[PDB]
Amino acid sequence: HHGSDLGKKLLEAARAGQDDEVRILMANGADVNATDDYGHTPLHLAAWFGHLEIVEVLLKAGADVNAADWLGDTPLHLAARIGHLEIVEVLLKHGADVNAQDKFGKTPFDLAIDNGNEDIAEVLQKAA
Amino acid sequence: GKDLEVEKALKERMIHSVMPRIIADDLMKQGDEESENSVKPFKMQQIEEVSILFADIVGFTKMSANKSAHALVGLLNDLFGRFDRLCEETKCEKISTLGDCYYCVAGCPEPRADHAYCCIEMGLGMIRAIEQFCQEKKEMVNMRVGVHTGTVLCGILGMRRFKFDVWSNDVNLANLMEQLGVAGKVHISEATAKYLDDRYEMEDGKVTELKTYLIAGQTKIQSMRDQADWLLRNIIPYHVAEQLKVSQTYSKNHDSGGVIFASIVNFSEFYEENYEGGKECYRVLNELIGDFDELLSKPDYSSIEKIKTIGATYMAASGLNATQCRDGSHPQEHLQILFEFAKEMMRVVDDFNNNMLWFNFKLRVGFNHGPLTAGVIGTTKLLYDIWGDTVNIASRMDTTGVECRIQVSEESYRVLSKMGYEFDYRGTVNVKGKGQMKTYLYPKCTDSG
């Protein structure tokens, strides 16, 4: 919104792990999908820090499914890059793309392969 | 009227002074408008199977022992004029020069089918020219020459002092091979020799200390005025601009001044080229270097000069623009303020490391201070540069450093210890030209230990 410092507060609480501040700020009409200079999204912050509670808080908050940073990466791509499996399943239940690739031109499969997490790849390989 | 055409010609010449031919003649039709407004937004590429050559003076320090700092300018101008002239007669694309070193590339804008032959012919012509000058003016100097072939990615980085350049491991290989070469002969690699057609002096040159050989031879006028003057400030500083207008060339010497080198250390392993080109990694490098550039805008950053960008490195100096002497000020605060400038450089790289996902970027920084000289090289082309013992000392001592540590010289250690900053003694490392030198680190057990 106008003067989206509420975005800064929500993002800082998102990667800080402070949930009560997130509730307080959303009570103030803050934007659900506020973005920073590089294009990060709070769901990508959750993938960074692996907070399933905040994942579900953002899901009930109404976050987008294919958020892309300046590197054009979906949150599923970031998750496969890090390797939080349960977040990967709870994200793919919502119906995200399977065959996408960012500006780096790679699908999440070989990415999860190189990051050293076979679980993401074996879960994703069964899609249709 | 005609002054507009005069400044148009000046601006076009100044574009080609810092940035190559084909890209320039393509960018003046405003293929990209963001590029045009940046000239007040560009592209990067990566090409395979090209040739690169380096050449260094032998005994470069010795010829600069007790001179007048003016003979050096003249002789360098003569040598480099002959060299780049020979470049036009042999159709090879220059890149830049690093003090005592001159290097070029073959077929960089568009591939050429006989790049290797042109490059070796350049080597032979370099040998002929240097021997002719040696016999004429009677100074025994030599050129260590090295060549390599492979793949390299080309682009322009930064927004201040930006210059077209190329990057890959092949540059490091060629530099090291020239370091392993012998005077008077060209030190080649088998990668170059796979298509050599053996029309030359085949020898196997190996080190006396990896498939290598040695060959011994055989109303726009105000807008255009602003554009052109901005470009002039981009290539050369203000003091030289005002001193030059009443003369032909430039040269100056300072008995004392600082210098810092700073390079990203863990950037090498981040070269995954699974994507075609890997240009996004270098876009990120562009972002970081642009952050460094915008750092310069601070008001207290007036006495600090970014000399150039070396590959992915960063070279800065100070203590030279302060030509006006005021007795109510201490003439030794320039080194201090540059030391803080380094500190905020480290802080900014730390912040960027925090803000980027799943990678840490560490830096090595080396500090030195002492005498040096500054000058201008080209004509119809331009380049500002500095020379001296201190610059090579700083480059050496920075390479024998540790990441996230401010490696500092012993005399600079002396001048800085009494003013407050805290350091721990690291050790003593051999330096060519000066023997043993002591090393100190500004971080004080900042790690777990």
UniProtKB/TrEMBL annotation, chain B:
Q: Where does the Guanylate cyclase domain lie?
A: 51-178, 258-398
Family membership: Belongs to the adenylyl cyclase class-4/guanylyl cyclase family.
Q: Can you say where in the cell this protein is located?
A: Cell membrane
> Which first-to-last residue range defines the signal peptide?
none
**Part of the full-length chain shown:** 320 to 1251 of 1355
Residues the record lists as binding Mn(2+): D56, I57, D100
Name of the featured protein: Adenylate cyclase type 9
